[PDB]
Subunit: 146 residues, 4 copies
């Protein structure tokens, strides 16, 4: 994989306008709603029986913040996401046995959330940069399976 | 598959507020930009070597209009997408040999387009209804292969 | 989708020569070995931390037998897999929350198992018929999600 | 990604028993038969209108030999497939616009061909090594898209 300098600039610049305290819960909650089978990885998170329960669940919001904060840190290591995600790959793959295909689904949900928060600013070219970003994150997190 | 009455209400309701003519060109254009290999099916449209050339291209816009018009008409037949798309499944599969994965990618870009236009109105539930929709469209379009 | 008379003849004909009891344990066992994350749905079967422990495990063998038996019975209803698998789609989707991608992975392993057992008899055409079959099984099993 | 030494030994040892002059055409022909839309990338190859035409087509056989000879060379660089496939990624991605998902399908077809040629020798553990191998090859060939 390879990020162009324009990919870097776009990822870094859009991410600087993202409010992680909102986006985190919105992204994980949306994943749990839209692709419900992913809820089986979060039985300890309490009520996930309805969309309103999921989007208002305080554990979902707290954990989505963690997710996006790790992504925010990863954006400072665009040219070595594999090394940067190595310990999270061991966690998700050797420990939790998360299906690699779900890392792609979360990427799709993040892209949706960015489209919602930025509207027209999320141009085709910007979406392409971020589609490359979430695909590279999925590849880096599933590395222990590969 | 099966659409719920709530899925139908959401799909019909949001689609009535879509500008098919612009949304179609935006959806096809984004597909070509975000998943570049799809450009190989549209060599006759012209130079598609950049986002600006793709999004400014009149044939992309005119064809996107056809695509979303057809999708719109399918929304009158949500319990029978397979039958309603039978002729277009023969065209895409037996004559154009479009990879079935590409029907899913176009569906994913439409969902991004709807998220951009509708913003916070595209709640997790609404996205779930549309994810189901674009999944069912891709199944109906690839029926000839299955 | 649609099975051809040649698809039906091939599927029924080869399946009559399958040893469901051994093939089922081999198919489930391989799924668990080749796509390790699937082990998380079968924690109650015991230690699945190696291929030898998985392939020697009596519960894997006994459950694989159920899976292929059910598949075998579905082969009596090739024009109506959705209806024939309705109850198992509710079980897998609404209760067990099995990711839809996993139904496709089990289908891919069954095709490998059939290739191992039948060798040159599993010609490209025969594989095509079975690929269609295991694709249609996965669609019917994930119907509750779509 | 990471190959274990056991993965290396298995990949190298099985590959040494493979007859590329047969396997090459059998693998590409099978891909063209089982996933027919891939035939659109080979219009110059002549008759691909039937399974017998495809499996007997001399261009398909000649090109499948090239494919597996490149893979055979790649097996001598297991720990750097990305660098080893860089020029083929530029060819397949920037030039030919092959869908990354097809590189996974060819991997699935190769695994089928190995299962056919080796039968029981293709144990679950050996399949797992080779599933990792064809997945890493798909990732290395699609690198220019990523
Ligand atoms: C692909 C983007 C993802 C990233 C950046 C990410 C990041 C993280 C991080 C930072 C943690 C916390 C580690 C710690 O605090 O030490 C974590 C925990 C976890 N992740 Fe992810 N994750 C991702 C996707 C997923 C997906 C797709 C799933 C499954 C649906 C998943 C399931 C979990 C689970 C079950 C935990 C542990 C939760 C608990 O504490 O019970 N993650 N993830
Ligand atoms: C939402 C799913 C899609 C729908 C509803 C759709 C619909 C249509 C329609 C109505 C036509 C026009 C046929 C006529 O003019 O008579 C068409 C043509 C075509 N479609 Fe699609 N399509 C879809 C997805 C795709 C995908 C994913 C691809 C490939 C990436 C594709 C490639 C093509 C090509 C190559 C043509 C012929 C264009 C030409 O000749 O200029 N379509 N499609
Ligand atoms: C060829 C597709 C499949 C078929 C025909 C199938 C069939 C079945 C059947 C007949 C049962 C038994 C229900 C009963 O005992 O009443 C079952 C249980 C189950 N299936 Fe599947 N299954 C398939 C794919 C999967 C996949 C892909 C997974 C997850 C990777 C899965 C996970 C499970 C689990 C967790 C159970 C419950 C086992 C327990 O309680 O011990 N199945 N399946
Ligand atoms: C993933 C495993 C693959 C490998 C190892 C591979 C390898 C190669 C190699 C070595 C060449 C010849 C380059 C030369 O001689 O200089 C080539 C050509 C090509 N490949 Fe692949 N390939 C792979 C998959 C694919 C797939 C999935 C497709 C599309 C269905 C594809 C389509 C082609 C085409 C169209 C050509 C040019 C053929 C001609 O000369 O017209 N390849 N590939």
């Amino acid at each position: 994989g390879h990020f162009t300098e324009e990919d870097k600039a776009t990822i870094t610049s859009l991410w600087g306008k993202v409010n992680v305290e909102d986006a985190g819960g919105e992204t994980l909650g949306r994943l749990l709603v839209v692709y419900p089978w992913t809820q089986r990885f979060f039985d300890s998170f309490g009520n996930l029986s309805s969309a309103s329960a999921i989007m208002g669940n305080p554990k979902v919001k707290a954990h989505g913040k963690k997710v996006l904060t790790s992504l925010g840190d990863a954006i400072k290591h665009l040219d070595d996401l594999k090394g940067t995600f190595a310990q999270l790959s061991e966690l998700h793959c050797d420990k939790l046995h998360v299906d690699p295909e779900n890392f792609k689904l979360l990427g799709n949900v993040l892209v949706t959330v960015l489209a919602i928060h930025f509207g027209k600013e999320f141009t085709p070219e910007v979406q392409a940069s971020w589609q490359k970003m979430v695909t590279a994150v999925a590849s880096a997190l599933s590395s222990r399976y590969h």
